[PDB]
Structures are given as C-alpha cells and as structure tokens.
Amino acid sequence: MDVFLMIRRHKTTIFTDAKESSTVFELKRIVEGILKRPPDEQRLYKDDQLLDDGKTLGECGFTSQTARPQAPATVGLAFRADDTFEALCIEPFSSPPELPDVM
Amino acid sequence: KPNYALKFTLAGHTKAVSSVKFSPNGEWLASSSADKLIKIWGAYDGKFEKTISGHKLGISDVAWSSDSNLLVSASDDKTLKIWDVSSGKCLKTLKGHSNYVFCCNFNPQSNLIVSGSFDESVRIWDVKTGKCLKTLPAHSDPVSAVHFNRDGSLIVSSSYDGLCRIWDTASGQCLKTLIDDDNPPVSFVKFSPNGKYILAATLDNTLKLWDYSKGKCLKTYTGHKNEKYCIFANFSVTGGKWIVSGSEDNLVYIWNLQTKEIVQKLQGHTDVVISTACHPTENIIASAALENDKTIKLWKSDC
Amino acid sequence: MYVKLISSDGHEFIVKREHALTSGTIKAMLNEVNFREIPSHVLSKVCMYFTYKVRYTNSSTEIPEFPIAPEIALELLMAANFLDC
Amino acid sequence: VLRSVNSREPSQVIFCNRSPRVVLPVWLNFDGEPQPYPTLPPGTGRRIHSYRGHLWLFRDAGTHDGLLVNQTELFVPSLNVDGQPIFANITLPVYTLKERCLQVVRSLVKPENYRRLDIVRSLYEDLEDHPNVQKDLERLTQE
C-alpha cells in the first residue's frame, strides 16, 4: 500500500510516496538523499508526535486512506542545530484571497 | 395426434397483428394490431365484421368481458380503452400508466380490469368508473402479461425482471414470487383453467408449467424459437390436452401437455407468429403474425 | 530525479522530475524553476495534481475526485492555463 | 451515424457507478438522438434491460461532464455466452487540471457573471465551452 506525503520544514516541502510498511528510518534516508543531512541529524513528526526510527509509517498513522495523492499527509521535519535540535517549525502557505462576488 | 389444417386467412390489418382472442361465447374473434385498429371477425367463417378505432398508437393486446359484450385494449399510447363491441364505441379511456401498456384482462366478474405496462407497474381498474383502484409496484422491469385466475381472487404477472408474481386482487398483496436459479425475462404468463397451475414463457425458447401451491416447475416445452418477442401461449382443452404457442420460425407449435412432445407444427404464416388463441368449444386455433405477414389464420382439427 | 519549483512567496516545493513534466510548460522551462506569479497555496495544489495525475493515469483502481476548494479555483485555473496541465 | 441498431436481442447490463458523481445514462436511439435515462447515485449499481447493438454513454447528471464506461466513451452490450449480466463500469476520467478547474468554477458562478471575473479574458471562452453530448457525438463520429 502506498502513502502519499508532504515532508515539511521551514519553507521546504518534499512531495514523496512511500509504502505503509516502510520505516521512519527509511523515510529519513529519502530526506537525506535530497537535503544532505544524515538520519541521525533528523527528527520526523506527525503533528507534534516524534516518530521513532523503527516504526512503520502505517504504525505512525499514515495509511492509504489518510495519505492520498490528491490530499497528502504532512510529516514535520527538524534538523540538528549544534548541541541540540531546532524546534519543529513549518511555515504556512500563502493565504487565499476572499471569494469574489460571483461566488 | 391433432390434425389442424388451415381453413381461413383473415386479411385487413396494414401492420403487424399483435393479439387474437375468441369471444367467450364462441361467436367472434377480436384482433388488435400495430396499425392502431381492432377488428371483429366471425369465429367460424372468418367473415370481417367491423373495425374499431380510437387509439393513437399501436395496440399490444385486447381482451373480452365474460359476457362477450365489452373489449379492453392496451396501447403504446399509454392508455387502455373499454369498448362496446356492438356499437364499436369507446366507453372509457383508462389513463394512468406512464409508458406503453402491453397487456390487459377482465376478471371473471368483469367489474375489474388488470393491466401491465413497460412502466413496471400493474394496475387494477374499475370497469364502471374507469378509475384506477390500485397501482401495484409489481416489478422492476417491463410487465409482459397479466391474468386473473378462475374466480378473480388472484392476479399473475410476468416481467422482464425474471419473476412471476401472484397477487391478491382484493388487498394488492404479493402472495408468491415464482423464482428459480436462472432468471431469463418472463415473456408471458397465464393461469391454467382450474387455477392450480401457471404457464410461463421465457425468452430462452422455453415454456414452463408451474405448480402454484408448491411453487415449483413441473413440465417444460421446447423445440420452438422464442428469444425476441413476447409470444402468447394457450392451453387447448376442447379435444386432446395440448399446449399451443407461436414461434419465431413462423410456425404454430402444438405439444402434448402430459408427455411434452411436439405433436404438430402449423406452416403458413410469413413472419413471426406472436399470438395464438384456442376456441372455447371447438377445436379451432387462431394465429396472428408480424409485419411481413399482417394476417390472422384460422385452423381446425378433428381432435 | 527531483526538481525544485519555487513559489512567488519563496516556498520551495521539491517534486519528482517525472511528476513535474506533467506540465508542458515545465518541460520547456526545464534543477530549479521560479514561478514569480504563482503563490504557495496554489503551487502546492499543483504539485498534488502532479501526484494525482501520475498515480491514477492508466490505472483501473477506482479514480477519486481531485478536490479544489472554492477560494483557490480561479488562481488554480490561471496556474493550470499557464502550466498547460 | 452513431446509432443503436434494432436488434431486438435482449441484453442485461449492470450500470455500475464507481464514480463520485450522480450519473446520467444516455441512450442513442435508432435515429442517433440522445435519450436520457434515470440517474445513478454515486457508488450504486442497477441491473437494467437493454439490447445487443444499443449505444450508451454516461455523463455527470448536473453538469454533463463526460464520464468513462469500461475505460472508454461509448458502451455497446456485446456477445453474451455465459448468461451473466454484462458490467458497465462507470468511472471518473483523470481530468486535466485546467478542465477540472473549469468544472469547479462553472459550479460556483452563474453563466451571467462569467465575464465578471479577474481572469485572462481568453479563459472566458473556456468557461462557456460547456460539455454537451451533441458536441461529442459530432466529435466521436468524425474520429
């Protein structure tokens, strides 16, 4: 089963899919291939929940039903910063204009 | 065993003849046609009597009252009409169906008419008022035939949905659905004259005799062709005990009711034989054929 | 393997290159591409469409609806008209 | 043209609506004219009575958006050898992003107020180029 994800940190969003049965650690390897930082320097999140390397994505709550291609699920990403980790911080997308009169 | 031979060809309709019915008193033959006309003929000599007109589109079926005075007809124009046969006048037009009306019959008392339509409903009508007394949500596909049993207490209907259903006339309640593992469209149904059995045609070249009380099939009749048209069949009871039906190979088929073997095939029509009728007292068959023929034929047997 | 599509408001969207080639424009424009006129609440939805399109094209598993909130329809229409996808 | 043939050979069909739309089956009669039939709620099926050689297409019932049936535009009941009803699986096509955008806008603005919009004037034409079945029938037969 495929899950469809947005991995987000600051003003960065990675669109990727993964298997429900694949691990958090394997997802960090995807991030590493793109953003250089090794798995040990990453923290992945579902909302405010720190995800453990050895859990599967299914076990964290990412499933085919909750993580769809047209509506992917968000994974938060935080990097090591010197002695500790930065706080989780996802910048919101731009806001939509008010609905014109016709709607 | 029987020896039906052709005696008269009745010519006059200008399109397919849909239905032939002998009057219950044996004197008359009524025919209906895609040409929107009803015609009356002498039952023994074939002599043309009169033409009855009024419907706006073709007619599928016509039926006599018990006293041979009234006719009801069922039309693609979505109505039925009640006719005074001696004057040829339309007494009532029964309106209510939302699509083609395919079949009709009086009850034995002849105070009620039953009708079935492409619109999947069966309706019960008051002969005197012309008002619809009951609309039964009878089937989920076109209704091909409706028939009252011998005392008017039950109605049997057949439908392209594969079912025959038996209805209580007074309450409108479905008392029994005849269902089998295989459900091809049911193209015709009729109670036997004693009301204990039901003859059903299906669009797989098969006629079946059902036991109403047990709800189980007792006999099948095959060898004819029937995959397209809703062909009318009959019990022949005046001489030997036959089943009679038309056929898409332009023949009338006659089977031995008990043994189920074909005993005669009548050749003469030039198109599909879609209607047959059996005289109430004499060994006489009426048969009617489609657009490449347009005639009724009368055949007589010595038994 | 991947390309980076950058919105007008600086958000950086990283998507599979094959997925970005869904847009005929992006094929020509193309690694990195800036969209000076398309903000992030629209470009993110365009990326979702890329995912949806590639996943459900030539498949017979039941196709769901691509959802579009009313507030983003016009810009997305303009983005889609611009992107030729 | 594209028209049903009067085969008179009955054929049972399951109209199976595997789409999120209310589906409107359209029968092309023996003169090729489109006839609308009762609609199917999303995610429902109905066995129906039709005929060999009869032509059907399927649309969104409120907007006339074209839909797929067995992965194509037109459905004709074919040879049946097993006695089972033939499945007509109705599904959503993968609409272009633009086309799906037009669909959502059309659903929110009345066609009087189409040109009361802050959009490139060229897309005005695309909004009012609605899907209609006759437009496709000329398309389908000219293919």
Numbering used by the authors:
A (entry chain J): 1 to 103
B (entry chain A): 32 to 334
C (entry chain K): 17 to 46, 58 to 112
D (entry chain L): 62 to 204
Lines from the paper:
On the basis of the crystal structure of an initial WDR5 degrader in complex with WDR5 and the E3 ligase von Hippel–Lindau (VHL), we designed a WDR5 degrader, MS67, and demonstrated the high cooperativity of MS67 binding to WDR5 and VHL by another ternary complex structure and biophysical characterization. As anticipated, MS67 had VHL and WDR5 closer than in the MS33 ternary complex, resulting in a more extensive protein-protein interface. Compared to the WDR5-MS33-VCB ternary complex, there was a greater preponderance of nonpolar interactions at the VHL-WDR5 interface, as exemplified by Tyr191 and Leu234 of WDR5 making nonpolar contacts with His110 and Pro71 of VHL, respectively. Several new hydrogen bonds were also present, including ones between the side chain of WDR5 Asp172 and the side chains of VHL Arg107 and Arg108. Unlike the MS33 ternary complex, there were substantial cross protein-ligand interactions, wherein WDR5 made contacts with the VHL-binding portion of MS67 and VHL made contacts with the WDR5-binding portion of MS67. The methyl and t-butyl groups of the VHL-1–Me moiety were involved in hydrophobic contacts with Phe149, Pro173, and Tyr131 of WDR5, and conversely, the fluorobenzyl ring of the WDR5-binding moiety made van der Waals contacts with Tyr112 and His110 of VHL. Together, the more extensive VHL-WDR5 interface and the cross protein-ligand interaction were expected to increase the cooperativity of the WDR5-MS67-VCB complex. Furthermore, the WDR5-MS67-VCB structure also confirmed our design for enhancing WDR5 binding. The methyl substituents we introduced at the 2- and 4-position of the methyl piperazine group were able to fill in the hydrophobic cavity where the methylpiperazine group sat and the fluoro group added to the phenyl ring interacted with Phe133 and Tyr191 of WDR5.
